[PDB]
Amino acid sequence: APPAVTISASYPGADAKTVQDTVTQVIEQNMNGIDNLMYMSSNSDSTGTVQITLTFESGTDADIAQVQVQNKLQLAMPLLPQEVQQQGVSVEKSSSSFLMVVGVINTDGTMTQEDISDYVAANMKDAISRTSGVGDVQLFGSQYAMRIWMNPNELNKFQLTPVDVITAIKAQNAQVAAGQLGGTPPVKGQQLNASIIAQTRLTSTEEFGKILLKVNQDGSRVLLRDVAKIELGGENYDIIAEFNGQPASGLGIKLATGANALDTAAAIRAELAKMEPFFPSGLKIVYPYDTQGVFMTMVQLPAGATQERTQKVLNEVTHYYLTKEKNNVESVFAVNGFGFAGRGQNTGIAFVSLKDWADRPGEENKVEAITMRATRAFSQIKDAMVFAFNLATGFDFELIDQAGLGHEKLTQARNQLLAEAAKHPDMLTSVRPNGLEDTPQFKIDIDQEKAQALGVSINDINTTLGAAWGGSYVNDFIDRGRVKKVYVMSEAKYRMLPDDIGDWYVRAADGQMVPFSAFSSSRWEYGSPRLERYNGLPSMEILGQAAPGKSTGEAMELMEQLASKLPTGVGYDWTGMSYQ
Amino acid sequence: APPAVTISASYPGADAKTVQDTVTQVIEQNMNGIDNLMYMSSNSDSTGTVQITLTFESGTDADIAQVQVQNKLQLAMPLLPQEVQQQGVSVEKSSSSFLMVVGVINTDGTMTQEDISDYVAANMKDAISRTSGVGDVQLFGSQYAMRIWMNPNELNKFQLTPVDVITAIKAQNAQVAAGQLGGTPPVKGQQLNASIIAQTRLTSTEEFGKILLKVNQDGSRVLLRDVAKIELGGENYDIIAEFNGQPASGLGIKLATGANALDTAAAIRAELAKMEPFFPSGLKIVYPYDTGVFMTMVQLPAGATQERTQKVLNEVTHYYLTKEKNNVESVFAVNGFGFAGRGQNTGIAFVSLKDWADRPGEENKVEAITMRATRAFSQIKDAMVFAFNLATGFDFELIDQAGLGHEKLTQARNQLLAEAAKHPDMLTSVRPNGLEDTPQFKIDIDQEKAQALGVSINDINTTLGAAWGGSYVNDFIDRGRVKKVYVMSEAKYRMLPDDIGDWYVRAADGQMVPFSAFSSSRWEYGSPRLERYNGLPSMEILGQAAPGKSTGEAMELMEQLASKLPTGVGYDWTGMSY
Amino acid sequence: APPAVTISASYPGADAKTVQDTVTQVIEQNMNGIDNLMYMSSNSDSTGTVQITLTFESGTDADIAQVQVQNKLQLAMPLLPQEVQQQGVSVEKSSSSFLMVVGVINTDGTMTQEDISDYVAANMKDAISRTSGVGDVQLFGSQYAMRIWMNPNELNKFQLTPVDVITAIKAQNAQVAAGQLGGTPPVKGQQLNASIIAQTRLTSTEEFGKILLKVNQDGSRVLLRDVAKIELGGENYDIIAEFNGQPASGLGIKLATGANALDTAAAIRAELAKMEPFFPSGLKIVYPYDTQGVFMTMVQLPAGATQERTQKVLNEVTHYYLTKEKNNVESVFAVNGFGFAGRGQNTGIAFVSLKDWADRPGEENKVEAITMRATRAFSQIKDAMVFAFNLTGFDFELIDQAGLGHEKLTQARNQLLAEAAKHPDMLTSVRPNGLEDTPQFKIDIDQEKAQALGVSINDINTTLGAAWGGSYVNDFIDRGRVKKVYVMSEAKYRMLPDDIGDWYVRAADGQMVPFSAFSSSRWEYGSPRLERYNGLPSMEILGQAAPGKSTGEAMELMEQLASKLPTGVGYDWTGMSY
Amino acid sequence: GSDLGKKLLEAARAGRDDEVRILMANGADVNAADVVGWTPLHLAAYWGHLEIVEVLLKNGADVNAYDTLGSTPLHLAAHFGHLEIVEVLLKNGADVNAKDDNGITPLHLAANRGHLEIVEVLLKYGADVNAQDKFGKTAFDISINNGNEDLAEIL
Ligand SMILES: CC(=O)Nc1ccc(CCSc2nc(N3C[C@@H](C)O[C@@H](C)C3)c3c(c2C#N)CC(C)(C)OC3)cc1
Numbered sequence A: 001a002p003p004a005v006t007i008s009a010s011y012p013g014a015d016a017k018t019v020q021d022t023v024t025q026v027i028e029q030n031m032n033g034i035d036n037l038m039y040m041s042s043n044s045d046s047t048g049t050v051q052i053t054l055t056f057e058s059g060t061d062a063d064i065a066q067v068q069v070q071n072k073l074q075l076a077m078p079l080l081p082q083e084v085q086q087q088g089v090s091v092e093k094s095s096s097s098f099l100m101v102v103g104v105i106n107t108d109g110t111m112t113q114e115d116i117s118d119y120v121a122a123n124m125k126d127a128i129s130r131t132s133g134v135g136d137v138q139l140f141g142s143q144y145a146m147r148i149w150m151n152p153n154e155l156n157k158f159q160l161t162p163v164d165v166i167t168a169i170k171a172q173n174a175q176v177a178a179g180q181l182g183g184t185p186p187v188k189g190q191q192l193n194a195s196i197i198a199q200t201r202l203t204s205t206e207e208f209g210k211i212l213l214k215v216n217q218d219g220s221r222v223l224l225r226d227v228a229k230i231e232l233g234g235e236n237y238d239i240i241a242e243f244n245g246q247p248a249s250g251l252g253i254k255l256a257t258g259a260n261a262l263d264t265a266a267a268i269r270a271e272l273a274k275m276e277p278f279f280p281s282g283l284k285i286v287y288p289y290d291t292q293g294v295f296m297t298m299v300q301l302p303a304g305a306t307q308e309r310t311q312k313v314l315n316e317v318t319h320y321y322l323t324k325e326k327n328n329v330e331s332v333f334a335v336n337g338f339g340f341a342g343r344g345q346n347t348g349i350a351f352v353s354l355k356d357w358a359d360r361p362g363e364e365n366k367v368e369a370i371t372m373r374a375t376r377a378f379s380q381i382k383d384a385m386v387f388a389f390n391l392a393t394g395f396d397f398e399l400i401d402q403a404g405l406g407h408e409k410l411t412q413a414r415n416q417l418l419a420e421a422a423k424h425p426d427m428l429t430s431v432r433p434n435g436l437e438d439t440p441q442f443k444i445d446i447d448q449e450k451a452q453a454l455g456v457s458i459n460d461i462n463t464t465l466g467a468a469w470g471g472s473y474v475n476d477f478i479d480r481g482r483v484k485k486v487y488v489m490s491e492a493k494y495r496m497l498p499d500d501i502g503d504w505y506v507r508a509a510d511g512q513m514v515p516f517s518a519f520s521s522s523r524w525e526y527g528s529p530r531l532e533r534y535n536g537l538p539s540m541e542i543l544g545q546a547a548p549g550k551s552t553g554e555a556m557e558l559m560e561q562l563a564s565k566l567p568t569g570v571g572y573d574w575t576g577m578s579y580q
Numbered sequence B: 001a002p003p004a005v006t007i008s009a010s011y012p013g014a015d016a017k018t019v020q021d022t023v024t025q026v027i028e029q030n031m032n033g034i035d036n037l038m039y040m041s042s043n044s045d046s047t048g049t050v051q052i053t054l055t056f057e058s059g060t061d062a063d064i065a066q067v068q069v070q071n072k073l074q075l076a077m078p079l080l081p082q083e084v085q086q087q088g089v090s091v092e093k094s095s096s097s098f099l100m101v102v103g104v105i106n107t108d109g110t111m112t113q114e115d116i117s118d119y120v121a122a123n124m125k126d127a128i129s130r131t132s133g134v135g136d137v138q139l140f141g142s143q144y145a146m147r148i149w150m151n152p153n154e155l156n157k158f159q160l161t162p163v164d165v166i167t168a169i170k171a172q173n174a175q176v177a178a179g180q181l182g183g184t185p186p187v188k189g190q191q192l193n194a195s196i197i198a199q200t201r202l203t204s205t206e207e208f209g210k211i212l213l214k215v216n217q218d219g220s221r222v223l224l225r226d227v228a229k230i231e232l233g234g235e236n237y238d239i240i241a242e243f244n245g246q247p248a249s250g251l252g253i254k255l256a257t258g259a260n261a262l263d264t265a266a267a268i269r270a271e272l273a274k275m276e277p278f279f280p281s282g283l284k285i286v287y288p289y290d291t292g293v294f295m296t297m298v299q300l301p302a303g304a305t306q307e308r309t310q311k312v313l314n315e316v317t318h319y320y321l322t323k324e325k326n327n328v329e330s331v332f333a334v335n336g337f338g339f340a341g342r343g344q345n346t347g348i349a350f351v352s353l354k355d356w357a358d359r360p361g362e363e364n365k366v367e368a369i370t371m372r373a374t375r376a377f378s379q380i381k382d383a384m385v386f387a388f389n390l391a392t393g394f395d396f397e398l399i400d401q402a403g404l405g406h407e408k409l410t411q412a413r414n415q416l417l418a419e420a421a422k423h424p425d426m427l428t429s430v431r432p433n434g435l436e437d438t439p440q441f442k443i444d445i446d447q448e449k450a451q452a453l454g455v456s457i458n459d460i461n462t463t464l465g466a467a468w469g470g471s472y473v474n475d476f477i478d479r480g481r482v483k484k485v486y487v488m489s490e491a492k493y494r495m496l497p498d499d500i501g502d503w504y505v506r507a508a509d510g511q512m513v514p515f516s517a518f519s520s521s522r523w524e525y526g527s528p529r530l531e532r533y534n535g536l537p538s539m540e541i542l543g544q545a546a547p548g549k550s551t552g553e554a555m556e557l558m559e560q561l562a563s564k565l566p567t568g569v570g571y572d573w574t575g576m577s578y
Numbered sequence C: 001a002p003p004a005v006t007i008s009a010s011y012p013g014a015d016a017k018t019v020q021d022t023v024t025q026v027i028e029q030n031m032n033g034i035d036n037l038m039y040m041s042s043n044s045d046s047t048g049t050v051q052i053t054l055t056f057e058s059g060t061d062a063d064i065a066q067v068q069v070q071n072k073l074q075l076a077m078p079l080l081p082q083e084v085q086q087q088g089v090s091v092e093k094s095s096s097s098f099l100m101v102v103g104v105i106n107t108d109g110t111m112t113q114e115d116i117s118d119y120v121a122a123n124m125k126d127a128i129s130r131t132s133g134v135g136d137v138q139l140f141g142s143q144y145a146m147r148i149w150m151n152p153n154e155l156n157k158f159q160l161t162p163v164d165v166i167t168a169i170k171a172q173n174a175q176v177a178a179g180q181l182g183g184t185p186p187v188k189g190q191q192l193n194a195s196i197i198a199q200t201r202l203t204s205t206e207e208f209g210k211i212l213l214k215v216n217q218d219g220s221r222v223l224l225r226d227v228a229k230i231e232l233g234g235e236n237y238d239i240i241a242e243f244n245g246q247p248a249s250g251l252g253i254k255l256a257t258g259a260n261a262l263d264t265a266a267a268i269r270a271e272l273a274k275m276e277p278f279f280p281s282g283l284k285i286v287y288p289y290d291t292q293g294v295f296m297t298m299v300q301l302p303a304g305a306t307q308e309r310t311q312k313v314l315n316e317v318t319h320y321y322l323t324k325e326k327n328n329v330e331s332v333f334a335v336n337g338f339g340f341a342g343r344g345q346n347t348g349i350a351f352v353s354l355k356d357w358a359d360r361p362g363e364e365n366k367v368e369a370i371t372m373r374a375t376r377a378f379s380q381i382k383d384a385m386v387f388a389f390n391l392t393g394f395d396f397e398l399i400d401q402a403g404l405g406h407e408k409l410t411q412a413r414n415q416l417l418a419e420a421a422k423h424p425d426m427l428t429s430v431r432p433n434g435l436e437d438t439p440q441f442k443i444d445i446d447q448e449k450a451q452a453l454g455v456s457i458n459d460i461n462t463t464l465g466a467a468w469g470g471s472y473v474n475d476f477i478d479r480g481r482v483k484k485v486y487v488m489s490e491a492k493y494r495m496l497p498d499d500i501g502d503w504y505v506r507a508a509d510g511q512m513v514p515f516s517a518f519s520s521s522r523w524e525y526g527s528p529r530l531e532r533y534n535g536l537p538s539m540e541i542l543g544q545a546a547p548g549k550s551t552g553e554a555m556e557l558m559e560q561l562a563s564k565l566p567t568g569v570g571y572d573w574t575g576m577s578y
Numbered sequence D: 001g002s003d004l005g006k007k008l009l010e011a012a013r014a015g016r017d018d019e020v021r022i023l024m025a026n027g028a029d030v031n032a033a034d035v036v037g038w039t040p041l042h043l044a045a046y047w048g049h050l051e052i053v054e055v056l057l058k059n060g061a062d063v064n065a066y067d068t069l070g071s072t073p074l075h076l077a078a079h080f081g082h083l084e085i086v087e088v089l090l091k092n093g094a095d096v097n098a099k100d101d102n103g104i105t106p107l108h109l110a111a112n113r114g115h116l117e118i119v120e121v122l123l124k125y126g127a128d129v130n131a132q133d134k135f136g137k138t139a140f141d142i143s144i145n146n147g148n149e150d151l152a153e154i155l
Helices: A016-028 A062-079 A113-123 A125-130 A152-157 A162-172 A205-209 A261-278 A307-323 A367-378 A407-422 A448-454 A458-470 A498-503 A552-563 B016-029 B062-079 B113-123 B125-129 B152-157 B162-172 B205-209 B261-278 B306-323 B366-377 B406-421 B447-453 B457-468 B497-502 B551-562 C016-029 C062-079 C113-123 C125-129 C152-157 C162-172 C205-209 C261-278 C307-323 C367-378 C406-421 C447-453 C457-469 C497-502 C551-562 D003-013 D017-025 D040-046 D050-058 D073-079 D083-091 D106-112 D116-124 D139-146 D149-154
Strands: A004-010 A037-045 A049-056 A090-092 A094-106 A134-139 A144-150 A177-181 A194-197 A212-215 A221-223 A228-234 A240-243 A246-256 A283-290 A294-300 A329-339 A342-354 A385-389 A394-401 A428-433 A439-446 A472-479 A482-490 A505-507 A513-515 A520-527 A530-534 A537-546 A570-574 B004-010 B037-045 B049-056 B090-093 B100-106 B134-139 B145-150 B194-197 B212-215 B221-223 B228-233 B240-243 B246-255 B283-290 B293-299 B328-335 B346-353 B384-388 B393-400 B427-432 B438-445 B471-478 B481-489 B504-506 B512-514 B519-526 B529-533 B536-545 B569-573 C004-010 C037-045 C049-056 C090-092 C094-106 C134-139 C144-150 C177-181 C194-197 C212-215 C221-223 C228-234 C240-243 C246-256 C283-290 C294-300 C329-339 C342-354 C385-389 C394-400 C427-432 C438-445 C471-478 C481-489 C504-506 C512-514 C519-526 C529-533 C536-545 C569-573
Touching: A004 A016, A004 A062, A004 A094, A016 A037, A016 A049, A016 A062, A016 A530, A016 B471, A016 B481, A037 A342, A049 A062, A049 A342, A062 A090, A062 B062, A062 C062, A090 C062, A094 A113, A094 A134, A094 A240, A094 A261, A113 A125, A113 A134, A113 A144, A113 A228, A113 A240, A113 A246, A125 A134, A125 A246, A125 A261, A144 A152, A144 A162, A144 A205, A144 A472, A152 A162, A152 A498, A152 A505, A162 A212, A162 A458, A162 A472, A162 A482, A162 C457, A177 C457, A194 C457, A194 C519, A205 A228, A212 C447, A240 A307, A246 A261, A246 A329, A261 A283, A261 C569, A283 A294, A283 A329, A283 A342, A294 A307, A294 A329, A294 A367, A307 A329, A307 A342, A307 A367, A367 A385, A394 A407, A394 A552, A407 A428, A407 A537, A407 A552, A407 A570, A428 A552, A439 A458, A448 A458, A448 B212, A458 A472, A458 A482, A458 A505, A458 B162, A458 B194, A472 C016, A482 C016, A498 A520, A520 B194, A537 A552, A552 A570, B004 B016, B004 B062, B016 B037, B016 B049, B016 B062, B016 B529, B016 C471, B016 C481, B049 B062, B062 B090, B062 C062, B062 C090, B100 B113, B100 B261, B100 B328, B113 B125, B113 B134, B113 B228, B113 B246, B125 B134, B125 B246, B125 B261, B134 B261, B145 B162, B145 B205, B145 B471, B152 B162, B152 B497, B152 B504, B162 B212, B162 B457, B162 B471, B162 B481, B205 B228, B240 B306, B246 B261, B261 B283, B283 B328, B283 B346, B293 B306, B293 B366, B306 B328, B306 B346, B306 B366, B366 B384, B393 B406, B393 B551, B406 B427, B406 B536, B406 B551, B427 B551, B438 B457, B447 B457, B447 C212, B457 B471, B457 B481, B457 B504, B457 C162, B457 C177, B497 B519, B519 C194, B536 B551, B551 B569, B569 C261, C004 C016, C004 C062, C016 C037, C016 C049, C016 C062, C016 C529, C037 C342, C049 C062, C049 C342, C062 C090, C094 C113, C094 C134, C094 C240, C094 C261, C113 C125, C113 C134, C113 C144, C113 C228, C113 C240, C113 C246, C125 C134, C125 C246, C125 C261, C144 C162, C144 C205, C144 C471, C152 C162, C152 C497, C152 C504, C162 C212, C162 C457, C162 C471, C162 C481, C205 C228, C240 C307, C246 C261, C246 C329, C261 C283, C283 C294, C283 C329, C283 C342, C294 C307, C294 C329, C294 C367, C307 C329, C307 C342, C307 C367, C367 C385, C394 C406, C394 C551, C406 C427, C406 C536, C406 C551, C427 C551, C438 C457, C447 C457, C457 C471, C457 C481, C457 C504, C497 C519, C536 C551, C551 C569, D003 D017, D003 D040, D017 D050, D040 D050, D040 D073, D040 D083, D050 D083, D073 D083, D073 D106, D083 D116, D106 D116, D106 D139, D116 D149, D139 D149
Parallel strands: A144 A482, A194 C438, A439 B194, B145 B481, B438 C194, C144 C481
Antiparallel strands: A004 A049, A004 A090, A037 A049, A037 A530, A094 A246, A094 A283, A134 A246, A144 A228, A177 A194, A212 A221, A240 A246, A240 A329, A294 A342, A294 A385, A329 A342, A394 A537, A394 A570, A428 A537, A439 A520, A472 A482, A505 A513, A530 A537, B004 B049, B004 B090, B037 B049, B037 B529, B100 B246, B100 B283, B134 B246, B145 B228, B212 B221, B240 B246, B240 B328, B293 B346, B293 B384, B328 B346, B393 B536, B393 B569, B427 B536, B438 B519, B471 B481, B504 B512, B529 B536, C004 C049, C004 C090, C037 C049, C037 C529, C094 C246, C094 C283, C134 C246, C144 C228, C177 C194, C212 C221, C240 C246, C240 C329, C294 C342, C294 C385, C329 C342, C394 C536, C394 C569, C427 C536, C438 C519, C471 C481, C504 C512, C529 C536
């Protein structure tokens, strides 16, 4: 595996195109003048995530690659949205696969999945992330934040917006540098010296609840708990895990490039041994995947698939292992919302651990035959790519927009190539896109003339929409001595349907409350939930196989001939296993 | 050659003192804790550019040096003006030379240098960067920017200023996160999940033209196209380059460390061959330099303009292409660039000779060509024009050690140069490496009048800066690729002092106030290029020993002369003389 | 030695908890993916400073360690308060002990301690800091800033606040990029090109004094000098030095990890020799501590001690060496406000330089016997740990593993220390390495009353912090060098609790509101120095094996005692005990 | 007219006294002006070259030549504290109350930089102490604003 550096960033509430055009492109335009670079690829997703992977020639010093990529990233940093910079951009030098998973459960049932995930994020992850040889750590869940879940009816009733909520939280959840009595230089002869302590960060839902939003003309008070439900809850709600069907969280650990696997695994266990004696009651570490005794199952649904549907398919897979394979399988740690494709609502993964070598006699109880049978049983699941494998001869093709054609034309060109490839089962098998299809999206046009006539500012319009429907990271607070985030977002029931758009009011310069419907219009359209790029140009990755006993070479040759017939401005390249 | 690392930064519309005092000094003060540093030198100029060069001991690993410099620079970033941070502050190994300079020309008269540079940026540069053996690739030009060229008469007519234009572009050329319908955590049983797509970045001059500035009381709309001309153009207009008189862009290509020169040159030429079928009409690749090129320097007087320099460069080009038609393959004329300084009154012609084989006789070799060229060019009046090819010299720094300031350091340097001129038996051609002070337009904003009128000083300074210097507002998407948006006055409203009073600012009460109401101006002298050496103000002095004297004795004299300069002036030897 | 990388940052006017919760925890959470890191520790102090020490495995390359730290910190910079980012964060790879001290005095007594410190900061420190081998340089004093010392009676008289002062300084001490006459792209036929010079940084107290704050009803002017005293003075006033009793400043120099001590020291001397010829008259370099020959004396008073009492202890130490040991001691360089454990009002250090070895005959006149006599002589100074030493028992960290909080952790520490004291046969001098809680003035702003009166929370918090803590506004140019501008209350208005009530804030309706109308206050205890270890709240505990016991036995007992502490309190061994 | 005009402008700027005497001898226009309207006399007055000033005046240099913003050699001498030059200009007929385009007079400029002897000489030669610039300000207002009490005495 040639070494890879990955750049990761996050823009909460952002669609794939917004991520691509305000983050990914800005970074990629600086990714040149880096030594021993073979290629770069990126994904920009409607989870508001970007990942850029830079792949280096074998034998490259990974420290030096990481340094040189970060150097170029710093050119782009001041041009990125503040919302992205504040989430913390990461630059990692890791293997792309997991060395182990550390699962955490509560055998007293006294902690939910969400509680466990916060415990792991708040008391365990950081120490593991600093352990030498740990390249990347994935939390299977989310740290708590303070969640302010706004009610638009209540806000409108008091002539308040989400801008007023955000402003108040920044003003009343504050950590103030206030100086000293008697500080230097003093009046000579001064004896008293003391720090002044003024506002300090809030620590509890109770304090957030009594933030004072306004004082009415009659003297009554509107507090934040009068317009919002206040609770601790995940920074996000996209990743949920289970261990043998019970609530769990965990850490997926990847090895740093070139680091020693035995040693690093051992350092991880020694760090976990320091934490264990301080766990709350019931909390227990489990070891669902140590790299053979193990394998994984990938679940990939179509784009558009809800969390509930992915869960339904994960339930089938876990059901199969816990019923059909219960003599071979020790455990299943299943994760909805994260998979081999990274983070996404239509994706999951199951980590499967087998019983002892000794307790599984016969070929038919070894990992190959178990995974073969599993894949076969899951081959009939409708509208889902589910397969089981432990851990060569395909090809890995990039179709590239080389003329500013745009996503829609690139899709047409891809479909043309895929249909042509389908007419050669003698040379090519299962030629298919690696990516996701376009899905319906809700296009909203803000009318500038109406906004200006009414005296509603564009910034207020955008903050109201983005904060309500996407969530806004406001500032930090201190939860049980740890710095954590504060997020404002609509309560779920006010951001589910198109007609809810009109229940949100913005305050004009003259004090009148104006509904979103007065200055906006909307329509359904299609767009991409995952935009791909290859060496900085829009691209679409196509996987496939040489047919039985044709060389990869002949297979690649035909793809190139078929590609030579595509519309002008569409080119191609080979990557990964096909690059040499 | 000792390894060297260069820091480059840009402050659009800034003068040399502004750049020095908000960027150069701040970076310099943060260049500590770096290993193996021999010396540091900088220049800050009237094009708003700074270059700080750190020279390391021989044998220093240049990669280690580059990363240590870069890390200290990056920790100083929040100390720099936003406008500088937004241009990118680059830190590169600078002691490596070019493997090749590739020219990209258009021969059929259909493309400007900006058009060609955009084509190169979007379609060629990155393929060349990925070419086996290539290290750094520099584009000589930029990708397009969206240029909004403002008209102050139209702005005033609608009671608008550049501040309103900038605000409107940030509001209406925007792309922000708008969340999802049915997103997590959802009401359980939700079936619809869809991204919300709100405003998207503008993609064309037409879309910029329709930005709504305001609606009048009688219901008429003022659009950005009603107060500005709108076009794709360059990010910067300081340099104009021509190849045998035709517009041209270029790529400067360096060899990656450890790669083979010959194989890398051939790989570049093979990659450019494969691109050729896709070029638009009249685009051609030329190769002026590739591992017999010589240079012709052009220097016009103080305050001379680009068009005046262009006229001289055109005479230099015409000379080579007629009088040296048997020896000269090409003249790459670069107006605005000069090695001794950037600016409108300087240029260089890079002259590429035909193959040695086709130039028999001593009269057709570089020495004889350059002597003939210099003799023909000594006719030219209102420019110094010198042809030359590339150790008796010395490289001396005069240093302000006690806070004396520019005007005193210059008087000290003048004392030293007069004294060195009194010893023609020991010293020849003792001169400044840098530039002389030139006239500047000093404008003083009257704070009392501004406050009495209710005119904000930020509106004043943004109006002046945006109009006359230009401002990078935000980014747009051109044919799928992210690029910059700049606002600036249309050229004809920012040329001369009388144009200042055509700019109006809007007071808190809504009245339009002309600049003449709250400002006054005068001519004064100041520097177009400020120099520093090891963190202190400096002036570099070049010179050579007289015939039949060694540099040793000539240096010794310079030290004796330097020892009689005013209190607080020191010196140091640098470069070849280190 | 395991190599250590240190991160230092500052937040003017912040208390320990503010520093810890907005800076220290943020950086620590982002110190991931760094190779070979053994442990991390931090202190967050009431001086507004943080120091985070990352210690790497033996044999780690300290260059790579430093680079990895710098890069992770760079990515965490946007998460820190702007006030911190704008001070500069530093990251150093150096030994924790001094290699040498460069002292500076004025032999003609014509420059004060404050003047000398500015001279060193402005003319000497940066060149030393760039010298190869120099890992860290501590100035024993402070560089000048332009100090705007605000008077709340005059601000209130003119219906102004520190917010108005800050806004005016930003507007009127500004460096403006204003473009050019005849700038590119130009019109055809343009003859003139010249820089436009608009506002420039102020350079003198006189210029700051005339900043125009407002124009009254009748047209009388309110100048900054009408509400403030304007003077050059230190960016801070925390560190004051003396050399043999006379005003001094200097540089404390720490050797970069892996550099050569003799080579570095000689490079420093060569750099000082370039500066000396340009010193103002009277200034002179002394050498009070070159690493036999030398030793140090630590002075550590309890938290809460004033600059004045620390000074009184240092005067006793200095007096002892210059009278009782005058036959053995050549010099004493004493620093009030900096100590073995860095910066604080309650700490000092004295560097002692002995006369030639040959002129100190007798075992009784060698460093060992001298330090032992001095330590004995200083062992009866009241409420101060004072000892003489040259640059091993155990090093224990008590750790908050469960969100317990400072108060509970202090209780657990005290339980452990009480238990340790009951085993004087196994453990001796089991003590905290840090500082005890002290009284602090807790002020609550009443959000209801503020809203009722129309007073902004931002105006209140700026007013309080700028007046009582100081605020870095922007930069100015002092004798050609960029330096800082600070606004703060003049001393007499920020000394006592009743002074809080003389500060007025302007409400939205224009009325002036005193602080007393919307606030209340009380005394409470809190920490002047919060410690963390591997990212968790911690308290360091030192001690040793009792006479005739091994270190292992004493450690084993410490662990046994630690196993009986309240739930959620853990421990770890560090430093010499790791 | 002259190529020699341009050389005289440069020689005067850069202080070269011999070169000025020579170019004058060979016919250079003493009132040659550069693009900002500065004559050799302006340049010699700004850069403080007294003997060049005297030499130009004796060869007919126009003592009240004004640049493109209305400023005269006396403005420049007074602003930059060149006392001996101020006296020579005034001795040779300089308009002591010349106003530039902003209504600024040599006394305003001397007063602003605290050049007290120059203020005194200007006043001897009949400088209107109450002359106001475009903002209504006098030399006295300038002294008050700058907090220069010695200057405020004299006015
Ligand atoms: C807008 C713009 O910058 N246009 C532009 C500028 C320069 C060029 C290339 C001119 S050809 C050339 N340029 C050089 N440079 C070097 C660079 C650092 O600076 C630029 C402006 C041009 C150098 C060489 C040639 C040739 N042949 C030869 C050599 C390597 C010896 O010296 C540098 C093309 C377009």
